[PDB]
Amino acid sequence: FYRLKKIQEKKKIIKEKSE
Amino acid sequence: ALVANTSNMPVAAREASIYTGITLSEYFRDMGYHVSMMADSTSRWAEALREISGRLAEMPADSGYPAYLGARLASFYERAGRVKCLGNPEREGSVSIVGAVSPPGGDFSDPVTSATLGIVQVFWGLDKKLAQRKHFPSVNWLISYSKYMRALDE
Amino acid sequence: TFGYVHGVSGPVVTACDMAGAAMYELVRVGHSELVGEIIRLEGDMATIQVYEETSGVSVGDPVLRTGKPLSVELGPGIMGAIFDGIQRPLSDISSQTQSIYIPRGVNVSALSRDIKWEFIPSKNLRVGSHITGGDIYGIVNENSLIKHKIMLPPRSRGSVTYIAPPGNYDASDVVLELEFEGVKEKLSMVQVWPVRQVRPVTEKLPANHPLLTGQRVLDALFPCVQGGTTAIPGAFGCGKTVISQSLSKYSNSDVIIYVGCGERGNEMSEVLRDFPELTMEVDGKVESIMKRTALVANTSNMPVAAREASIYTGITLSEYFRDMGYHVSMMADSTSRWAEALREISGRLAEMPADSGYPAYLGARLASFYERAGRVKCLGNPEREGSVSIVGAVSPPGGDFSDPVTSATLGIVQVFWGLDKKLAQRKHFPSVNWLISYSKYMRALDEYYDKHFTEFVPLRTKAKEILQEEEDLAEIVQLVGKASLAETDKITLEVAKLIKDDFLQQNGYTPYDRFCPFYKTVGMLSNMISFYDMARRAVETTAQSDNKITWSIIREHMGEILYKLSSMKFKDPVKDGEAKIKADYAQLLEDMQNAFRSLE
Amino acid sequence: KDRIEIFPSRMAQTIMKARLKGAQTGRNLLKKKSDALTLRFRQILKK
């Protein structure tokens, strides 16, 4: 669970950087 | 006619091998022939799906497998059966599918074993203790089932 | 030459305007100049691991970039001193600040520059002589136990241009001047070596000599060697700190480096108080133990990042003495606290974790740490031989030997001294399981044992067979109720108890079990095994006759022998020397042999 | 000792649950054997 949650948050962070 | 794909082949071909095989199977099915398709392993196919699901950074489900593993297995397993073929000749063929779930253990919580059991009509489980005793063929005779009894009773 | 702090997340500080900074360079963060080390570089921003509490650090604080990496000062003045996790001497801080608390941002030289060292050159060098790395060009008498060899640092070489005459010099003077290719180098008594780099040796050799431990078990059954690596993954209360401290007190090593990495503060004080009161005669003269030991304190309530520096500082010090021809047996009493520090930092770094939250590279750090142990041929013309042993504790949660640290450790170390909490609850100390432990150096030392003892090896084998047979029986006896046991099996069960209670356990806080000289361990084992063989033969030759010597018959006939056998531990080797102990053990063996003659 | 020492797994859950059911069934069947022997013993005691 921990690793998957951080993966989802990192994906959102990458998406914010692209905007 | 065999389709050859080894464990050291690219994961994308490892996934597509099953689709190629069943495509050839249906092709001959539409000729009115009775086709019997043997799989070496569906755990290797599921393994390819797990590897690609990871590489695509999509959200996994149980034990790292994609949540849609069951949908892919249903797509493969439901492409079979006695049919009335298309075409003027009114011919009727069939495809039988024999799957193969490599057992990490006798626990059918295994995502691949569990999804297969909910789909396949006949399950020929192989007992570990009979194998250890060199009793061959090794069939549990208690956990196996076949749902075609009433169909064959006639 | 400065950057600026960008953000703080705890033990990890982010800094900007540090484009030219390299990994593992030291920095000074904040107006107190806190010591830290760069972990990551992201553009012109650096990720800094800070070895001191970051409370009060503000955004915009300066960060000084220091070209030198985390390093240790090596020279005279180490022995007898206690250091913190980054080699700041605690006796010099307490003597200078007059405080009881360790201030943050303290910049104190690792080795005092006021002491006038007694230096004598080798008398074999001349101007124009060619000297290479590891060469010894003089000795400093730190004390009466350890002769401190002044080595030419590794990665340095050249011709001698000047050597200081014998006399009194401090650590700020120049002792040796050498030149290589135009470039001249001036050396004092203190050299600097990056703590994360392994000091080079001529050849790593097999370990073929016992590391003497003041224990019956952990020596007779599971030997350790000079240069070997062992782990003690005991649960809390198992007594692994006592095993480590006992080994430090009573061993055949020349220098002990004791690393308290995450240990309770009371344990480091216990060493500082007790050690000065211990004795070890050198050449007819009584001397204290502390003159041949050094210790590093990085207690549990200190900065967590400093736990990594403590572990590497300890082994780096060990190698330095190894290079001088001494046998070093360093021990870090935690390991898990180091891996814990890695987990906490990895979290702040937002790294992807591996098994149970630990960094994926945990195994990489442990492997490279333990491989710095070993018996070596030293670099340097004088042809020294040394060793570093590592005796590392591990703290598995719950006593479950399944965590990534215990698992990874067991794949690295060659001796496994597993402890059983259920033995500690019974005060069966040391709480050694003796069923899951092993030592891969048994074959290596067989040559040693044959040369000096011979009798030891067949006794070791018989003792293991008895203990294993007892365990095989206990599994079923609990279910049967001792109803189906043969007379030969009852002998195994009762002698095995004899071994367990009197041989494998010893009270390390007594005048008689505080140290167990090897000759005593094998002596009293010989009697216990000799009893086994005589008792087993007595029944085997009579069970088929018209009177079988069952346990109840031998027990009543020889009840005095069974008590004497249990008393054999109470020999006090300091009051009663070797001659009395051997004579006493020999007499008990004769008494037993006579009892059997009258019995059978 | 305290555990059978089988590494944690879903496979271990299935084996342990089946092993537990077996042990409980054996306990009850042996208890019935004991009760039958006790009645005859007591009847034999009176005889």
Added chain:
Amino acid sequence: YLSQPRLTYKTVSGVNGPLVILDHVKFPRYAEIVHLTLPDGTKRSGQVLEVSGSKAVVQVFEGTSGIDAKKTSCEFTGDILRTPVSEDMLGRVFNGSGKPIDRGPVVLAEDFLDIMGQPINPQCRIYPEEMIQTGISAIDGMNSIARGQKIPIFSAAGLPHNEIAAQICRQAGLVKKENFAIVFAAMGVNMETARFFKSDFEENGSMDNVCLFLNLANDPTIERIITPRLALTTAEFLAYQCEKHVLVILTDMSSYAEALREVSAAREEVPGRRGFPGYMYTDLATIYERAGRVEGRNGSITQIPILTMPNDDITHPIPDLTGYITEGQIYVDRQLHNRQIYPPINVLPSLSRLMKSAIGEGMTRKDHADVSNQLYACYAIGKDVQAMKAVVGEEALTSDDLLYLEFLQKFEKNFITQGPYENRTVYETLDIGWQLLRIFPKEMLKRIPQSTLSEFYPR
């Protein structure tokens, strides 16, 4: 001191769980305290747990319910939570935040100390060499307490661990044959527990030397992880600056661990076991290691971090990590309580990691260590006999086994059972030990040398 005016911000960027994120902050300081006012006038406080550029993350102690985004007003104190301390805090009752709740005034400080404290230089730390007489044979005999030692009581919900701690507060003296200042941190407990201790302290007539910190079950869960430091901060002032011997008792540390776990989850930190932070050990050491004597000063701090073991699981991270840090534990269980044995202290899984040096010639009596070790052997074997007898039956036992069953039965009712107001000396405890040991013949007392048996056993 801090002479510059403080700044007030209305720049809250957003709120996520217990964390209020501010932007546009001038030179944010790490681990500084922020006071904030809600639109309705409510005042709350929090600490900056992260700074980055112009942003700062404030953890609010009272909570984030009702925190606005436009009207919220925050001010930065410019320092870390330094708290007022004075000697005359003894006799006062405080809440979990350090504020008075006894209708008295605020603290008139003698100084301001950093709640985080400082580690004591191990070179100046002096090893404990004094024994405290608890009056409980189960402790004074087999698990002695030193002055400066860290000994929590491991307990379980429903067991009288609060009564044992209360008893210890009254009848804890010295074996030198003395007034301890008690700091009692009541955190994560109900009113009745806090009132029980408060009343007992007055009943004992010792309230003039008792400082209370209350943080009840209905109080915020974030304050529950500073209250221990507030208690210890006072203890450090008293012990190391005023040379007062202080006894610091922290109530169920498990409420601390749970409050800590809540913060770890809120900040998405790397878990270890059972969801607790991977740094739980380091945080516990920060609390526990504020104890012990310091060379050259006549004060001391003794800790008793009592904790409840979740589901009686001795391997739960809370008792596990504590067991690794503290000098052993007392440990009570339900098997003794369910038989109306008081105190219900089970010696077998217990230990005191300073006992070996705090007993013997010059401390208590020379046979102390020998009596303790043999009693442990006899008690553990008696338990082994019951484990066997439960299956094989009493008729399957021999005289070698019945001796340990007799010992075990007489041991628990004569040695362990005392009563809430039974105060025995350490010398009487050892004499009792011998009364139990004399159940066995000399040949079976294999943990005791003949140099001791020959003197004491004959009586």
Added chain:
Amino acid sequence: YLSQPRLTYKTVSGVNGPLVILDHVKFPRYAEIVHLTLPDGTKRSGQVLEVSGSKAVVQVFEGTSGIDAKKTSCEFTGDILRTPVSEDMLGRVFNGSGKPIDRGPVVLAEDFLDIMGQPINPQCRIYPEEMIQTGISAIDGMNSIARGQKIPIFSAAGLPHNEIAAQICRQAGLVKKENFAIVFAAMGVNMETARFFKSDFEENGSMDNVCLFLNLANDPTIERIITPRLALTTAEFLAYQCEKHVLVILTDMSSYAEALREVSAAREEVPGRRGFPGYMYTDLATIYERAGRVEGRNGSITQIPILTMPNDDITHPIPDLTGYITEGQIYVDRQLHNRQIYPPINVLPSLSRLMKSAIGEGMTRKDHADVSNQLYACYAIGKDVQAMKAVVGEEALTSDDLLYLEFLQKFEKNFITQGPYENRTVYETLDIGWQLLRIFPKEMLKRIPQSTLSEFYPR
């Protein structure tokens, strides 16, 4: 001939663990190789893991310590790590990256091969048949090894798997009615083990045909990712171009898997079971399957990789995925080791896929297949009898159960137990098998046809 000057960049974007991230790179090539020159002159190499736009992520083999983000120079080779290979690499010792460590010269590039491997057409693959007579009864009798097979040795920490592998190497050969070249890849191996194998090869005079690649436990952990690819690349050259028979030993695929995990975590890849990359299966298959024979050649590659099993289990992802790829295993156990049995090989969980075809009339003995099966079943039953005896006692077994218990004890003592310096032939192994089978009356040997029994059983 790529006669095009190489570009060198200082446009370092950042460094994160073992990974160096570069920017402003012209047409990055995937899996290219970059030579790094550190500010102090140190040279190191790394391989590109991914490219995107003008950015590239480089995996640094020797380590990243000391690399800055301003001065480090990065030279792109323009090609894939094709390594020099030569037939005269035998009699040499290389480090984990293929460089001399034996004071010899750099291998002269007789040719270059892409270490990634060139897939072999299954149509031209030749099925292995000939038996290798290893000398070890546990292998030659039951789980026989064919030349061209893939049979790793599993073990846990502390077991003598290094001794078994060494024994096979010096005792290797064919069943007769001339020898192997050795390619030995050490990945994360300690110095004591490295000297064990190096000395054993020298003491037996084998070094004339041995090529060592040593990546020791104290060497870089990223480098070992290519080490196994360099070893097999040499094996493929020697076996398929130089008509040699090559036996390839991989000292630990578990330290290899850890190296992959370290990289996978560093690049924030989505893991599978226990944190390992989801592509572990593929990465192992591309190494394990570099074995067997090909049409038109006389040489072959036989692999016997070694894997340390974490926590003594066999469900860990590393041995789990390997089991799906390789053709059986040996599986060195611990229960046999604790009993001082060598080789401590457990025959029940270990299988050899090619065994059914590599034995029998025309290859070994008519009865080989029947003897193996009967011995296996008898051993398996004996273990089930032992499992029962542990509960009901030796007094609750019937006559047949005692026969299986007698077999079990004598089987391990006379058949499995051998010693490291004694070799037995496949025919001698079967004769011993019969001695164990003749413990039973012929009526109980239900897995052997009557014809086989009549020929051999009464002898």
